[PDB]
Amino acid sequence: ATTCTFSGSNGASSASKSKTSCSTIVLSNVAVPSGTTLDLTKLNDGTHVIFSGETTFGYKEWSGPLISVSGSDLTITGASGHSINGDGSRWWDGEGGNGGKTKPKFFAAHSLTNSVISGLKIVNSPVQVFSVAGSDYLTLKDITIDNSDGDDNGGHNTDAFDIGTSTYVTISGATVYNQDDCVAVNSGENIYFSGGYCSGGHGLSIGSVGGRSDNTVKNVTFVDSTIINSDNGVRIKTNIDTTGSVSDVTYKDITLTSIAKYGIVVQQNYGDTSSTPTTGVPITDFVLDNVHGSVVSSGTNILISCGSGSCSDWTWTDVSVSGGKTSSKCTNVPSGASC
Numbered sequence: 134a135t136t137c138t139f140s141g142s143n144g145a146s147s148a149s150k151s152k153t154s155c156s157t158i159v160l161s162n163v164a165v166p167s168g169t170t171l172d173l174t175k176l177n178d179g180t181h182v183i184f185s186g187e188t189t190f191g192y193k194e195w196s197g198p199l200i201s202v203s204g205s206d207l208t209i210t211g212a213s214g215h216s217i218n219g220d221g222s223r224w225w226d227g228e229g230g231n232g233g234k235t236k237p238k239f240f241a242a243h244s245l246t247n248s249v250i251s252g253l254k255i256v257n258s259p260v261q262v263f264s265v266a267g268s269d270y271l272t273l274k275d276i277t278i279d280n281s282d283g284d285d286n287g288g289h290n291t292d293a294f295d296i297g298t299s300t301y302v303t304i305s306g307a308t309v310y311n312q313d314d315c316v317a318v319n320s321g322e323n324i325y326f327s328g329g330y331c332s333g334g335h336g337l338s339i340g341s342v343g344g345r346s347d348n349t350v351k352n353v354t355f356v357d358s359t360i361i362n363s364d365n366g367v368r369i370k371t372n373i374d375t376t377g378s379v380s381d382v383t384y385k386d387i388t389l390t391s392i393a394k395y396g397i398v399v400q401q402n403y404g405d406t407s408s409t410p411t412t413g414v415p416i417t418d419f420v421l422d423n424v425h426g427s428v429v430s431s432g433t434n435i436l437i438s439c440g441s442g443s444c445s446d447w448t449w450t451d452v453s454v455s456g457g458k459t460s461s462k463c464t465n466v467p468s469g470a471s472c
């Protein structure tokens with residue numbers, strides 16, 4: 134049972150070169166050369182990866198990812214005291230991924246099967262953090278993402294978890310301070326998020342759905358989590374004039390604290406909210422159970438922008454959201470739900 138340690142400025146290199154010879158690879162204070170990826174791709178089945186000390190990256194305008202892992206039956210963890218520091222303020226310019234500097238994505242969790250990622254502390258990502266894709270039976274456990282420095286420092290589009298084309302993804306105990314979605318499920322099945330703390334971002338959202346390879350969202354559960362000081366709490370966004378499916382989505386035991394814009398928001402006209410919502414991405418079997426909290430006074434409690442017939446079978450129990458205005462602009466609200 135081999136064990137390998139890579140450190141410093143040439144660690145990334147050695148790591149990529151010897152990873153298939155190491156049952157356990159320990160990354161200690163590795164400084165990743167600018168414009169390169171920590172390539173942890175295609176590890177041997179069962180590999181263990183330990184992040185130790187402080188991981189850093191050289192500065193350069195590129196698209197990332199800074200880190201990339203793939204493989205089977207993998208275990209990847211963060212040692213006590215470790216941190217993985219993006220020092221994103223080198224790139225933050227207020228324009229995020231839609232302009233200005235090209236900023237690199239942080240973590241490509243692609244093509245992972247039966248694997249666990251836990252205890253990772255990520256600090257100041259340049260732009261989105263976790264990109265989850267084409268993965269099955271993936272656990273993201275006790276992850277901390279602190280981009281709080283970006284609040285008044287031009288951080289934009291710092292999504293914590295972007296999910297697509299994946300099944301059986303479980304996210305538990307995440308702590309997130311950012312400036313965009315805490316979670317965004319673009320597609321996938323059998324997804325479960327529990328015990329999270331989402332601060333400063335744009336909420337726990339399904340979507341945006343439609344206009345991609347995979348436009349199906351099914352069996353998603355958010356439970357026992359807090360959304361605090363964010364623009365939105367509960368959000369389902371489907372792209373206008375697209376096709377797809379959203380069904381079997383549950384939000385349960387959700388706490389909303391000081392939500393700035395929308396406590397609960399469902400828009401089937403996402404991408405152009407000045408237009409009537411379209412009907413190609415129906416939302417059925419939407420369940421809210423014990424969602425409660427506060428919206429600021431200049432905010433809106435609940436906004437529901439559904440198309441004709443494209444929203445049905447919604448079960449809303451114990452929903453108690455208040456402090457904001459009540460919208461007069463909801464459309465085609467399913468029975469049993471209300472604004």
Ligand SMILES: *[C@@H]1O[C@H](CO)[C@@H](O[C@@H]2O[C@H](CO)[C@@H](O[C@H]3O[C@H](CO)[C@@H](O)[C@H](O)[C@@H]3O)[C@H](O)[C@H]2NC(C)=O)[C@H](O)[C@H]1NC(C)=O
Nearest residue numbers: 247270300301302303322323324325326351352353354381
């Ligand atoms: C809707 O999605 C739910 C969450 O993904 C899903 O529950 C989860 O189901 C999986 C698989 O059945 C359970 O995991 C099992 O299989 C692996 C493989 O050996 C074992 O390691 C596990 O111990 C377990 O036996 C999860 O435990 C389970 N998660 C929850 C929170 O209970 C539902 O089955 C999906 N429901 C529908 C109707 O599709």
Ligand SMILES: *[C@H]1O[C@H](CO)[C@@H](O)[C@H](O)[C@@H]1O
Nearest residue numbers: 136137138139159161185
């Ligand atoms: C690689 O080297 C480091 C330095 O001791 C260890 O922590 C690790 O377990 C492996 O031996």
Ligand SMILES: *[C@H]1O[C@H](CO)[C@@H](O)[C@H](O)[C@@H]1O
Nearest residue numbers: 137138139140141144161
């Ligand atoms: C970082 O730590 C490792 C431990 O094996 C060394 O191999 C390397 O030279 C650097 O000191």
Ligand SMILES: *[C@H]1O[C@H](CO)[C@@H](O)[C@H](O)[C@@H]1O
Nearest residue numbers: 141142143164165166191
């Ligand atoms: C190792 O070398 C790299 C690049 O030469 C530095 O960025 C790092 O701080 C360490 O000196």
Ligand SMILES: *[C@H]1O[C@H](CO)[C@@H](O)[C@H](O)[C@@H]1O
Nearest residue numbers: 143144145146147148150
């Ligand atoms: C990075 O450094 C290592 C040293 O082991 C090389 O093998 C690799 O090809 C790259 O130059």
Ligand SMILES: *[C@H]1O[C@H](CO)[C@@H](O)[C@H](O)[C@@H]1O
Nearest residue numbers: 138139143144146147148
């Ligand atoms: C990466 O690490 C290996 C040994 O761990 C070295 O051989 C190489 O030169 C680079 O520092």
Ligand SMILES: *[C@H]1O[C@H](CO)[C@@H](O)[C@H](O)[C@@H]1O
Nearest residue numbers: 145146147148149150172
């Ligand atoms: C990581 O880097 C090594 C050499 O630095 C390659 O051998 C490997 O395929 C991957 O690019």
Ligand SMILES: *[C@H]1O[C@H](CO)[C@@H](O)[C@H](O)[C@@H]1O
Nearest residue numbers: 137138147148150151152
């Ligand atoms: C990659 O790292 C391993 C560590 O044992 C070396 O054996 C190899 O030569 C390469 O530098």
Ligand SMILES: *[C@H]1O[C@H](CO)[C@@H](O)[C@H](O)[C@@H]1O
Nearest residue numbers: 134135153154155156177
């Ligand atoms: C642990 O696993 C590594 C590869 O994952 C082997 O190189 C080692 O011999 C042991 O089986």
Ligand SMILES: *[C@H]1O[C@H](CO)[C@@H](O)[C@H](O)[C@@H]1O
Nearest residue numbers: 134135136156157158181
């Ligand atoms: C390498 O070392 C880690 C932790 O020491 C083990 O979990 C792994 O199985 C391999 O022995």
Ligand SMILES: *[C@H]1O[C@H](CO)[C@@H](O)[C@H](O)[C@@H]1O
Nearest residue numbers: 166167168169191192193
């Ligand atoms: C990223 O920027 C560094 C400067 O520190 C270069 O060394 C590297 O080649 C890349 O352009």
